[PDB]
Amino acid sequence: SFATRTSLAADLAALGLAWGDAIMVHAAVSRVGRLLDGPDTIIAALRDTVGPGGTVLAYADWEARYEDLVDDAGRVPPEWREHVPPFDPQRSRAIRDNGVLPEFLRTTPGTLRSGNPGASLVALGAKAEWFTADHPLDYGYGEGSPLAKLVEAGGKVLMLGAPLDTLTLLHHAEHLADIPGKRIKRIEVPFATPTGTQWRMIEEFDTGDPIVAGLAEDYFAGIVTEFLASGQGRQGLIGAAPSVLVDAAAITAFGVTWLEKRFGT
Template sequence: MEKPPVRGPLCTRATLAAELRALGVRPGETLLVHSSLSALGWVAGGAVDVVHALLDVLGEDGTLVVPTHSGDNSDPAHWSSPAVPEEWWPELRASMPGYDPHTTRSFGVGTVPEVVRTWPGALRSGHPQTSFAALGPLAGRITSGHRPECRLGEHSPLARLEEAGARILLLGAGFDSCTAFHLAEYRVPGAEDRVEVGFAALTAGGGRAWVTVLDSPISSDDFELLGADYERDRPVPRGPVGAATCRLFPLTEAVAYAGRWLPVHRPPA
């Protein structure tokens, strides 16, 4: 069977960097990137050269941050793609490897974050499910103190990115990937509710244990609608990077907008 033709355009490290600059990415800034490699077209050098291009534009004084979530480290009782037999659940909880920020692969966030995670000098936050990796002068500040009972709230890198005045780049990704909206979830009425969150973690003695904590409920089901309203009401720069239409906007502004939007569109039950 004949393979389908390659889809372009052809992107290189140099063309990606030029288009990122044209979009408005600045040297020295702190940038949270959500990405889709396939949306860009044919990238010579793949995800590695996407990271090179981002670092070229940010320069030595800039900090690159990506989500390196590992949502597969979770309670099998909640798995649905695929679901697993209930009789497996105890053994899966007992045998799942504990989260190690140095070796646990990211899951479900694309290939660019995995490249950043393994990049020389990268630092990664400590949450077993919702970690972030960072490169640059602010990497330690952004990734430290990520508490197990706070996936994406005040004790996560999102709050540190807010303090740093970071911007968000949706590099071929949609608003459904915009994790910063979750920070607003922790600040709206109902955030005091708690749900059980389970994962495998390393112990102080070098072993592993299944841990269950209480955390605020989170959902991204309506983030595309939230993002569309945000983009309608605020000037969000848009531009091409490769084949993708990309967006660049301040994290603080997006979180504030979501904080006003969520109580209206998610009224308390």
């Protein structure tokens, strides 16, 4: 049978999602079961559960398919530059590699989208403007980023059936961790401007593979599983989906400690 916006809100409240929360969601929509409005049922239920003073967020990123073309310095070959679609935070699609919910949130009326393309978040609700403002273009998973703001605001992250290694916030722990050997990525990015396309080199720690050597690609999942084993966070069903709800500040500190124990001096 169908789960509804009402039934999902009951499940979310039971799992610990609280009135006024800033909630970042990662979802595997099919695992939730039958939904009367599909992915939009999830968005509506989240909004119902945090209420008007809460904020609903997701990781947008952008497709940036031209990245396959760049040279070893990260630059776009001259013959391709004119063809590459520039980033526009109001128009560029969210990436769909981990389901359609971020794109569906992006196109829900009222949603705002932050300005660092590959690190961009979407936000809908009371603090959406603040969460998406002034996203630094370099090291966009670090200080002053939407992820840093989620920690500062005491926000939460919900894995709604999503694979645990897709918890984007742990890239903020990677950025913060005092460990050596961090992998740095440099890539040229085109930005839409009223005066035309402006290209800029972006530098950040790589988030496409673990920040340091010796880790499997899915190592974030193990960090989350250890966090839960330590007695932190909450687990329960949302619809039919096994789900995990964690405090943003708590999981970030745990991930920093996890990395510093294994790679620090």
